[PDB]
RNA sequence: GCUGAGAAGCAAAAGGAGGAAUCCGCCCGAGGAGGGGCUCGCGUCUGAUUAGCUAGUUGGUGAGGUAAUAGCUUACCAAGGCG
């Protein structure tokens, strides 16, 4: 579904999908969890998309993970 | 919106950010506040051993000009203006 995805940019290169799922499973149960990779070369893009189980917990992710700091680095939260 | 009794005639634009939402801009009107331009009453030094001064000068029309009123300009008419 795509209300219930949230987008993630600005994605460090060194971040696991493990601690990106544990800091924005706080906001609620994630369905899916898909990091976006570079066909020809494997490496990350730095981004990813999020499907929460919910829209309350999809909203409350968009508003305030915002600006939010992982490995260092500020990462961009929004709708898909 | 501007010209014009009207008929009509005439006039604009710019994208850059961001992955998207969105932001800062852009063009045309209509207001607000502030900042400027003008006009006028009043007040604003000494000398009479300084007494007459002024002719675009003082007003009128027509054309121009100014962001705007105005001899601001110019031609014609009148003989005023200040003391
Ligand atoms: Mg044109
Ligand atoms: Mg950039
Ligand atoms: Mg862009
Ligand atoms: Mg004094
Ligand atoms: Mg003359």
Same mark, same amino acid.
């Given at each position: 579904?795509?209300?219930? $995805? @949230?987008?993630?940019?600005?994605?460090?290169?060194?971040?696991?999908?493990?601690?990106?799922?544990? *800091?924005? #499973? +706080?906001?609620?149960?994630?369905?899916?969890? $898909? @990091?976006?990779?570079?066909?020809?070369?494997?490496?990350?893009?730095?981004?990813?998309?999020?499907? *929460?189980? #919910? +829209?309350?917990?999809?909203?409350?992710?968009?508003?305030?993970?915002?600006?939010?700091?992982?490995?260092?680095?500020?990462?961009?939260?929004?709708?898909?």
């Amino acid at each position: 579904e795509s209300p219930y $995805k @949230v987008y993630i940019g600005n994605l460090a290169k060194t971040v696991t999908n493990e601690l990106l799922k544990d *800091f924005f #499973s +706080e906001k609620g149960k994630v369905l899916g969890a $898909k @990091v976006q990779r570079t066909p020809g070369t494997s490496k990350s893009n730095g981004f990813g998309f999020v499907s *929460f189980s #919910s +829209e309350e917990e999809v909203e409350a992710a968009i508003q305030a993970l915002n600006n939010s700091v992982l490995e260092g680095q500020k990462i961009r939260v929004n709708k898909a």
